[PDB]
Amino acid sequence: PKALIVYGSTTGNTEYTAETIARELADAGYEVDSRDAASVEAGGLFEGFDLVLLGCSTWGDDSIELQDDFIPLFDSLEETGAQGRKVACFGCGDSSYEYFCGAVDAIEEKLKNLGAEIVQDGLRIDGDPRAARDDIVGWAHDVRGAI
């Protein structure tokens, strides 16, 4: 099948995460398209894809603010072709903050409001994702078995 991976990454963590999940789907036969959210246009972005995975980090001094490159996509989520789409979300964060991986919850909530089909609960990585490689590959294997 074809999978789209769109990520907003500032420090390289979410990018590394996206890339580890990309390699696992490609190994299972998927044709994978991995894109930085800074370079995509929301209008019809998901058309033609069997599975869409969205990843983003959480920022903000008081509230949950999504990663800067992802904000425009989030704000135009209704024009992407999400209704009825198989999607799953991922993000890196730090459990010391009150809303750990709060960007995953905000994206999952909006996607459910748009009628997307959430295939698996969001992968939330605390600290260095390189330390959690195993959880990352494990979650990729689970989203694949479900669809």
Binding region for a second copy (CB under 8 A): 78, 109-110, 112-114, 142, 145-147
47 vs 97, beta carbon nearer ligand RBF: 97
Report the SS3 class of residue 139.
helix
DSSP run (H or E) holding 13: helix 13-27
Q: Which range, of 22-30, 32-40, 54-62, 80-88, touches ligand RBF by CB under 6 A?
A: 54-62
**CB–CB of 125/132 below 8 Å?**
yes
DSSP 66-83: E-TTTHHHHHTGGGS--T
Residue indicated by tokens 């939330």? 124
43 vs 60, beta carbon nearer ligand RBF: 60
38 vs 118, beta carbon nearer a second copy: 118
Question: Could you say which of 6, 21, 101, 111 contacts ligand RBF (CB under 6 A)?
Answer: 101
